[PDB]
Symmetry: C3
């Protein structure tokens, strides 16, 4: 129910987070097959085959029968080690992006949480507006009944009333909308959520921008991923270099053989050579090769890896400019939130005193209760529009921390301190 | 001209629909080559080759003249069947997404069709606004001429007139833009389109939400595609399992070769063995093999397929909760459309009576005709903003029908029933 | 500083432009390896291997020792030439898109610049608004001090003041934002930028739209790229046709051999055949093959390439509809800009005369100076909202020129003519 608990149940409800985790699992597991080729290749084959050599040596008839194990083991080829390193760095990549997605979950969660509150706010306010305009219409109606005014005004207040009805329904509708938005990252409905403890609000001042810039230089996930991409490009480079490598290898195998000769040609002077055999063999030995020159195969690849490299570096710098922009913008947004909160506070005070004034106006009955509710309307609107400003302060409070690439459950707990009273959702 | 006919010509004018159709054609045709490998592989590779030995067995010249056909046919390998099933499911995928795109074309079609209707409205009424403000400029002008109100007001009205002119030009401009928007899907410019039969609106109540839930769950295209994706992942799993398959084979080949001999070394005791060859051959037989352990080849792939599976499943549930969200939101939007239509109707009646009232004001001339056209302004603005609301009702109709995964020409035919009088576009 | 210089320093600062450049370098360089296969394949693969017979073959140990260079050279396979042509066309593609981004850098570069100007504008004027409202607060305050009015008004003016303060901070904030936006393209902060020379502002009429269309047919980069895609699809088609090609080839290689015998079975009646032999060889000759029939390999591929072709064609027409839409829309936007500029000009004149009027009002003291500054507020707001309109005129100019697929530094120079006075940024 509390934002913390909301994070808790939602910690498993997210598929994409779990999806990404599983993807990381795919990467780390893929490292295994990345290690695989270096290991020896035990194998087996078998065959049977009749043959008939027509023409010249025509009339011979020869079935053939054989089977063999074939162990093989390459030794010298660093390219596989290279690919292994690629797999490693890619794994680190997947790790980082996974953490990123975690932070994303945090953000979305908090956002969706606040939206419900805001919807409740607008709901109630639009309601009070409804009643106010309603008795406005009733008054005006009665005023026509005694004939003081033109019918046109009656229809006017009519239109006001219908309009505000639409305003009710759309808002109430937005309520459940946001509710389902919450279920989207939960899979569960919630009857109620804790109200903000506005009385104990934190008007915390921002840290100086430069240190934040430093921490940003140190620990944004994205730029880190860029650097990993760069190093990976370097790995691609040496992998392109790998083509020049001599390929030391070692075969090892044994094989049975049968083959029973037949046909009239075998008859007469078989000379043992035409006789059926039972031979078997245990071949084992080195294998090796070297490309020397291959039409410029391993040449263009080099430059390709190079362009890939420098381009990746460009992406890195782009990320750099990006994080600078983002963090500054966030900081600034926080300040904006501050000032806005100030303004709306004062507005609250204003509408309040105005309200009390008009209430006194009804105290000796100078006005109508309707008007009192008009001031009441302005009052509430100002109220949780100010609350809205506070939540915006919170969101910015996360974004800057998000900008750092840091974030944790603990910040959300600090948020959880802010919550207070239970509040029914619908 | 009518929305139905517009859809009719639209059915061929769309490239992307036809594109997707042809893509389905590709997906189906590819199933054929998916069936292909099982078929026998006939072949030929005759060639000639000189040879000149040296060192130890130096000086014995020769030249082979090989020529042989090679039919081949493996029998046991389920992995290919697996890939066939994959291709099948892929074809189902392409099918589903194709139908989806059809619905998409429908939606966009009706949308663009309505936008024109709206722009016409805004155009006309804006024009009336132009005339009204104009004659205000004239009145105020003359009022300066007789020496009354200060020049500043004159320039004010001037600004009004110029501003509203700009509004005209941008209005007309948007009109032709929308016309082109229509041509974009149609490839045709249309001088005129049918007006809505506003007199006979359909105030249908929405069905209870749960039934719609059950239906859409039963037949949404997207989630269906997800399920196909999951099944495909399972197929990938058995395909990973396929690496344990022994590979039964059957070679079948034949042909002749003539290696003529030459060189001085052949001279002396040729022993028939050094005579020129003239042999042919008819080899045929099985070629079995089983991989045994191979460094963990067919291992990591298993878990990879597994993670692929579960992640796909997570996507499935994701899309599930998603469509729940969407359909509820749609229902809600429809209700909003209802209430809005109500409100604007009443606003229409109101502004109308206000109009008639002021007209009566001019009946003894208390006002100016411009004022009457101000009431007229608010009037028609209200009118076809209400029309706009009705179109929104239509769009929501198609949307709720869309989330079902249903949709067809028929609802659009009912929309065609909604249409009435011809109206020139520009 | 001037827009031209800004473009100049920026012209190298862009990563993505340089990125695309290097990518073009890749596309070109890859043509080399595309040419590569036709070249001769020199090679080598020496190796050594022990052998030990058993069962009938038992007791005759040996160890083969082989070494051989291996040149190879294919003669006839058009598919390689085909793929070469593919690579060529791909190079053309990367070229074109590179040109696209070359325009893209320009557009944004103007955009942010004008945004900076605008931000400066709104900033200053908001400041003036601040001072005005401030003195209203002071007036109302003092008025309460002598007690002419209710406290509620005091709080009202209070609220106005805090609000406008918030507007200041967000304004300044937006200023620095835009500054950083500029740095994003440049990597450099800028103290100052040239003011527009509004006095000599251009108002050229657009060329008639049809001529612009014929011009459009010439060289939009996008559509050209589409046509290249089509031709590429055709190349894919002939490449599918290339599976019918007989594969004429030429083997050419030489190698030595040693192979030493061992074992007691070799002893006795060796018959020369059971003796060590240091043979060498110089094999050379033709190679050839032809598929005949392969289970429908090169069949489904044909239809596949065909579908690829037609789909590409559909994309081409899609691009056609696209460019028509965009160019007309641009033209229209220009017209809108014109009329808007007209309107705001007149508004400026109006507010000006109103200002002078009220100034005269203070000349004999009929009003507060604050009010005069209110007119001042409306004044400047109108002023550089009009400026904003002029920049929109410029942006539209660049847009329509962009739709042409044209654009150059020279148009930006023509823009550079428009600039005038130096202006500090913050």
């Amino acid at each position: 129910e509390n934002l913390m608990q909301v994070y808790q149940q939602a910690r498993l409800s997210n598929p994409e987070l779990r999806k990404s985790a599983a993807d990381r699992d795919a990467a780390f597991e893929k490292i295994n097959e990345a290690r695989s080729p270096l290991l020896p290749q035990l194998g087996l084959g078998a065959d049977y085959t009749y043959s008939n050599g027509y023409r010249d040596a025509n009339g011979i008839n020869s079935n053939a029968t054989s089977a063999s194990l074939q162990l093989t083991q390459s030794i010298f080829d660093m390219s596989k080690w290279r690919a292994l390193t690629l797999q490693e760095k890619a794994a680190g990549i997947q790790d980082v992006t996974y953490q990123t997605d975690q932070q994303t979950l945090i953000l979305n969660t908090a956002t969706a949480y606040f939206n419900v509150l805001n919807a409740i706010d607008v709901l109630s306010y639009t309601q009070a507006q409804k009643e106010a305009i309603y008795r406005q219409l009733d008054q005006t109606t009665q005023r026509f009944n005694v004939g003081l005014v033109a019918i046109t005004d009656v229809q006017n207040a009519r239109a006001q009333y219908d309009t505000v009805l639409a305003n009710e329904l759309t808002a109430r509708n937005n309520l459940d909308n946001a509710v389902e938005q919450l279920r989207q990252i939960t899979g569960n409905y919630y009857p109620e959520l804790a109200a903000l403890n506005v009385e104990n609000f934190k008007t915390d001042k921002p840290q100086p921008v430069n240190a934040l810039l430093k921490e940003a230089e140190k620990r944004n996930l994205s730029l880190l991923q860029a650097r990993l991409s760069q190093d990976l490009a370097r790995e691609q480079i040496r992998q392109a270099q790998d083509g020049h490598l001599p390929t030391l290898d070692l075969t090892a195998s044994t094989g049975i053989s049968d083959t029973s000769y037949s046909g009239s040609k075998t008859r007469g002077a078989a000379g043992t050579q035409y006789d059926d055999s039972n031979m078997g063999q245990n071949k084992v030995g080195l294998s090796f090769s070297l490309p020397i020159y291959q039409g410029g195969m391993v040449n263009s690849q080099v430059k390709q890896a190079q362009y890939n490299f420098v381009g990746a570096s460009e992406q890195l710098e782009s990320a750099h400019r990006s994080v600078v922009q983002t963090v500054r913008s966030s900081f600034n947004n926080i300040n904006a939130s501050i000032s806005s909160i100030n303004a709306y506070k004062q507005a609250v005070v204003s509408a309040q005193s105005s309200l009390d004034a008009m209430e006194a106006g009804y105290s000796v009955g100078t006005r109508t209760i309707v008007d009192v509710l008009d001031a009441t309307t302005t009052l509430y609107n100002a109220k949780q529009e100010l609350a809205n400003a506070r939540y915006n302060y919170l969101i910015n409070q996360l974004n800057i921390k998000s900008a750092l690439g840091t974030l944790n459950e603990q910040d959300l707990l600090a948020l959880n301190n802010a919550l207070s009273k239970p509040v029914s959702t619908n």
